[PDB]
């Protein structure tokens, strides 16, 4: 029984020497890494032919519709004067009724199929305002029933021109229309061009009642098989059995070994109790962490097959499926590292540093979090750095790291004439944030893992 | 009396072993932690509300009223010919005639009220001169008497084209007008609108005598509660009152401990005596904080429902207030992992070093003091990031961060041709800043903590 | 025999003191450090000038041929509809024809030589489109021939008016030409100015088929003697043939040296048998640097001296040549300090830690790899850093070292609404991407050079 | 004698103490602390009115006189076409012409004094080309005598028109002209306004031939009393006395205490005689510093009385002399925390440390200078970071503290296509020079810097 423990426990040099067993698992591992790294690049070229596609259309569409555009302007894109509204709406629907005879690329419209769109109408033009609107500031008065309603023009493709705005209680406008195109530039990755359906949304957005009036552009894309397509005289699908069949060998072998490893345990305890943590010592966390790569690879594989086949369009899961499973391939060979100390230095140092980490994690999370939504509210206003929780979170972290510290003190410069409390508010949260965080927490954060390799050393 | 003692400084696990005590402490921190963050974020939607309407405001008039005015350009707006001073200043005036013709926001007149408005009038615009001005470099001579006259002229909202500029004395051009509108914004969040008053000031700065002068605007915002408004159909105060009841109550049970640990005290130096930073044991500065804590979130919240109720206009201290008292609600709960050493390292290891860190700062700070001082005066009509002593105290921080090194280097290359002795004087400042606090000072700052910790360890 | 091998490894003073040994070794390196900095600074105006000339005709052509281009837009620069791409396309044709009368600088047309161009004619004008290519996305149907059709029009210096293009399915248009040149700037520098040969391309690319057209414009720089060229009144000669016999003479001595080492190695084993690792112990590795160096240095200087004749053109490969040796040849001095402990810290500490640093490197790389691949695939699309692999590299790498961090993180900002699923899988990749590799990974490599100066302190 | 030195050795406290010594000079420097500070803040508003009104000049004069010019244009402002360049050459000459009536400064002409100005000329407008200059690209043909030849047309202030540039041989174009303007804004700091002379040169740079012709602006400015001028009813003298006063008061102390600690050596060094780096023990360094910070005040208080004075004009010398006195007083004052231990760990690890840091840097800078001459001539031509051998260093050194990492990959990215064998050689420079200097000698730097701090420990 010890023998046969102590041989569970060997490496698979001295598995090889005591039985002579070939290491089969190793060489798969080796295979595993070729082929599903191949397999993710291979897929990679599809990926980036849909993204491409979508995004060049949408800016596109951007210089086409939105009068005066000019690239690096979404953001502050907006219009000022009436004059200068009514003429980005009459432009962008005069483009619509254009696009045949001037655009570059070929589109063709799509009418009705239900709301916002009438039967047999290509472009919708709608005005949203407050159902009762009276606004007199020069009494400070207003009688408001804040019901929207809306009120909505339909164009047919080849009197929209007698649009009158409610300016006074007008909460926004939009223009919604659907193109279709064809992704032709799948072509030379030897696939049949897909059909796109994009649906165009521009707003011009009045809900601050500000006097700036932000104009935008938004695309969503639907993905359909071409009816009967033809290509003159047009291997992936080997390649992905391969790579299905490798990793159904490897999560077999895995398995096996797991059995094997419970029922030793399961002998090693009944044994012990005739004569929990300790029992989790049979569990080859590395063998988890290979049947959880498997399974990720394979549902990829899947995923991938499906979307080459036209049977599904989720190209972002599959990329993370496949992208997941690529790492957590690359990671596991670091298994057969562990036998020799000489190269098992980082993985020792983790298993003596992670729990007392966790811990020290613990009472850094509650200071970590105080300073996340106090800054988030009370900066975000007024620094672009601090909009939403995750920007706050994602600027701390930074700023932890010694990075992009001056432009975020430089952003509440401006304040320091409007806003002199703000600012002096801004001054002590970020000094006394940075103090903190790099000079103490992060100090015994890292002599944590230090002490640790100490010990291990 | 050993015992009382002992059970006053033990654990609330270990107080309800030997007592049964109910934690109720405990649960009172867990429920102000989720009702402070809750309420912070719920005040943060008005006063984004407020922020955004004075901002966006703000914007749209500097693309009224400034000739040519693009975003971004703020810094450099300025006129260079009087024929371009003439029509920036006319086309201000003839936009602030046309507004109700041509603006997206709905906006009112303010006539009369003070200086330097007339009765009646809107619109001041006004032009600032030395009394006596002759100049003549022909000659190198000059006659000045630079007591300053103003001029102004009066427009009424619907003779100013006849205005004159005396440019050889001129020190400034600035006009000042006040428009009325109604922040509708606020529906969105079941608020009444407020009446928000703009004061505007567009300057034309000339104190130079530069041949450029820039043109700048600015607002001033002042709320109000509109006169008997009316929303059709139109709880926050119940949760204000839950916080104010929370934090009550957690302060007199603060209070009730300082008091038991204060009469501990008296008798354990009274029993000494018969048988100060001693004294300083029984005082548990964690509830001293949450009283100062708890004093805040009160404040917060009275001030917050002023402002719900439209007593109170000041948002920003309000959300100083609140975010403050957040942050020390989050950090309170850390009292509790102090009786656990496995969780009490950064509190221990900064008990340990505080003082050893203080006394290095006393030494360190005036050299950081001097190089302050240095920097500001020598580089900062040069320098970009040294213009004042708060910008220069940031950057110094941040290049001992090893932050935007690089371009404060860069930034004095213009000046290799012009200003040679500057740019050597410069290299040797930053080279020696960056190398005795970056090498030298912060390592021992950081070697300090690290032998409190391996001292506590 | 044992004296002989001390004296062998005795140092340069020692040896002078025991034999009055000359050093005539350090002179020669220190006199190469000087020569061989100095022959360089010299080759770089050359090299300079070179570069200088391509870079600043090329941006001429930019500015003369494109019309509407400006600086900084060659990454955006773009056409969007028909009679954009007809006007960019006419104006860069128009604007070859009228070169000699508008350019600044003076070009020659050049004619025929082959493919695009036919005999006599200087622009050829390619439009190349698939063979047969259907596209009717109104009814989701298309019939392609995917071969590529090329017609070209050609142009002779001084119809193309009547080019038509098939934009449903054109793929691209290329305009190409050349142009020659003199360099005249040479003649500040005292050498006779080359004759260029640019050859300019013109590319409005459509293989994306989005509507967008991308338009850019490159040139390849080639360079000849000019025939009989005559400079009125018109030594680097002798300066590279002293560098070339110092390299040469320390060359010998060190061929001499590493075979007086290889000799005493020979005796001492012979010996050892009589009564590998160990092998290599008389082998001076700082001879054999020296010996690469000046085999570097004077493949170098031989290529200079062909530049120079005008027998070579090979600007790059000599200046990397050239660079690389001035690098070793200041690296190698420090073996003269090997010998003092107190000099010798880095080198010690070094050849104490390479081993170990090695062996762990061995283990962080597969982490590194599978990172550098899953955001390269799944991040790419998305992500201006992630766009190659050596870019993505490259990003990973600076993060690292806490350089450029929140522009990593906000670069995804914008996809947290369009794709928010790669949004969350980017925040979980950053976030453990930098924690593991900034205070695990980077802390125990920094920790094992610190203990190998902790063991040779 | 032995209680003598150890007296001679005791602190403030323990002297007083001793002897009841007064320490006078401990308040001597906090008053100077306090009075140098003042006196150098103060001299600050004169040495920014001085810089603001230059560059503010020197900004308009780019407005006026270069045609289509736009702040941030500097860099890459040019000309592509024979129409532009004479139409910018013409502009400018307008421009100067017609001053008077359309700039918002006041001008006047300077005439005459000089070359390039003829006798009653204010304008001089010079071409430089090749004496003779025959370039046959086409014939691949030149005959050149590059001896330039300079032909200079003079306008007066109120045939230009006619001027004739030989394209194919032309040097540059230079505009010269001086304009005389008086700094009024002086008045806001209670002095008498100097009187300004600009020298402006307009270059229109062609040496590189290359088909783009750059376009700058530059001015000098000299600095002139007004003649017999007059402000109106028009103390910094006083407080400059109080300066000069306080520092020759504490140079005195500092001499005096000197000279005791050299008579107290002398007469220890002969007793031990009859019984150098110990005699480098009765030097107090501290006192040294001392004497040199008041020789630099007073030279700076002197320099600062004659530029109010309006005799001397060269207010960066004395802005420099200024801010390192005060800076080094400043740091003086560390002197007295050298006697307490808990306050002199920086000093202590300084002088423990430095030795050992020297030699180690010995070995380092041939290193660092390898890397700097090879990165200056290889990747200079293509890298905007490596143009000159500071920016060189300046890059390097960011790179060693890890700021501006990505930035410096990326822009080598470009060069790629073009130039791969650049590309690649600059991935192996920079990814070698950051492993090699921040993992390597970074840490060894700072480990004898924690070991020194750890033997005073
Ligand atoms: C009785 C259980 C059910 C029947 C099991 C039958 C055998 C089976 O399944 O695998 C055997 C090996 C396993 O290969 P592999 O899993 O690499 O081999 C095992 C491991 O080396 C294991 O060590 P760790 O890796 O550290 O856990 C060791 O303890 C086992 O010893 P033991 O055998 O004495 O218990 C080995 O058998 O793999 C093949 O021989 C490939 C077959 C396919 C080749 C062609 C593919 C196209
Ligand atoms: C090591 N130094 C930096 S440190 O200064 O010592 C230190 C140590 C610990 C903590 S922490 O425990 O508060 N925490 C905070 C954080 C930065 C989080 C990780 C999760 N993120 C997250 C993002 C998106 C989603 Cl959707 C959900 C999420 F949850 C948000 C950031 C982090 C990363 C790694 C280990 C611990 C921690 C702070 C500072
Ligand atoms: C730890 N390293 C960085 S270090 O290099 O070791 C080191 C150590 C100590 C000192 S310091 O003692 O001079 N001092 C300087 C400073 C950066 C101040 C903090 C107050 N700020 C402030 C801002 C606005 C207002 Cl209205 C008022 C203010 F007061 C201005 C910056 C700081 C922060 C934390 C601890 C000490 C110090 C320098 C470097
Ligand atoms: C020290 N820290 C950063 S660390 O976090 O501890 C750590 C330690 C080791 C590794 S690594 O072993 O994966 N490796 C990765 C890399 C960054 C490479 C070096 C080669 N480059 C390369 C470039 C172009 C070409 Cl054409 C070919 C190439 F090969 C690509 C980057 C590197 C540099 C130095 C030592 C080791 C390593 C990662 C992190
Ligand atoms: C040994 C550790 C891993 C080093 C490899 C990381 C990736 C290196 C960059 C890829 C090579 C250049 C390919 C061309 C990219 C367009
Ligand atoms: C991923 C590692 C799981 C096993 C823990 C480490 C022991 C080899
Ligand atoms: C905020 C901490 C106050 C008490 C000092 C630390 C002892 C638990
Ligand atoms: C480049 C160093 C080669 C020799 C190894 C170090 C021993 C002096
Ligand atoms: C500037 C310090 C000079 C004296 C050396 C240190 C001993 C107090
Ligand atoms: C094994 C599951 C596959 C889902 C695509």
Known sequence: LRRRLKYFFMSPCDKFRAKGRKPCKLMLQVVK?????????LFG????????????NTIAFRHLFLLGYSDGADDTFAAYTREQLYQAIFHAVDQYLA???????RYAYVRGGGDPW?????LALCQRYYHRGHVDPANDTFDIDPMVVTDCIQVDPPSYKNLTLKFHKLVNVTIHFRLKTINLQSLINNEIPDCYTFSVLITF????????????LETQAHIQECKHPSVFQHFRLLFDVVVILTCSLSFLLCARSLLRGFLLQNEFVGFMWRQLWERLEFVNG???????????????????IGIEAKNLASYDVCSILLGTSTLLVWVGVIRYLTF??????????????????????????????????????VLGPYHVKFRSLSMVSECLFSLINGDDMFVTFAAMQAQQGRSSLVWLFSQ?????????????????????????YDTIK
């Open 33 to 41: 890494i070729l082929v599903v790294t191949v397999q993710l690049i």
């Open 45 to 56: 070229l599809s990926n980036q032919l849909a993204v491409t596609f979508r995004e060049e």
């Open 99 to 105: 696009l045949p005879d001037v655009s570059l690329g």
């Open 118 to 122: 009438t039967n047999g109408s290509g």
């Open 205 to 216: 957005d009045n809900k601050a009642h500000s006097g700036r009036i932000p104009i935008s």
């Open 286 to 304: 590395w063998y988890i962490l290979l049947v959880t790569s498997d399974v990720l690879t394979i549902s990829g594989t899947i995923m991938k």
């Open 340 to 377: 020799f100390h000489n190269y098992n230095i980082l993985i020792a140092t983790l298993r003596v540093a992670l729990p007392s980490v966790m811990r020290f994690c613990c009472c850094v999370a509650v200071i970590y979090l105080g300073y996340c939504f106090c800054g988030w509210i």
């Open 428 to 452: 002590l949260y970020l000094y006394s944030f940075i103090s903190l965080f790099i000079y103490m927490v992060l100090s015994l954060f890292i002599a944590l893992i230090t002490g640790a």
